[PDB]
DNA sequence: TTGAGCGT
């Protein structure tokens, strides 16, 4: 229902990359990476959105590795 | 090049 924030993404990581790693646990809506608009590189997070309540918790409900580092899904603070 | 945090 909510979209969720993922740290500790490397920063080579793109939004195709994770529609591929969360895309395993449920229906995804979305996904974007901040970057900064002069350079296009990752500032080492970005966001994303299920469909199902069920498959956001199971990813909110442990941490993630992602190109070779932990990441963890929280509740973000819009 | 960098590594806690929180979305043009």
Sequence with gaps: ????????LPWKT????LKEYFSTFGEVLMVQ???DLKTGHSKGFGFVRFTEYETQV???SQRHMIG???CDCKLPNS
């Design 58 to 60: 199971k990813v909110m």
């Design 1 to 8: 229902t909510s979209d969720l924030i993922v740290l500790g």
């Design 68 to 70: 070779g580092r932990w």
């Design 33 to 35: 990476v901040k970057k």
């Design 14 to 17: 793109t939004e195709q990359d």
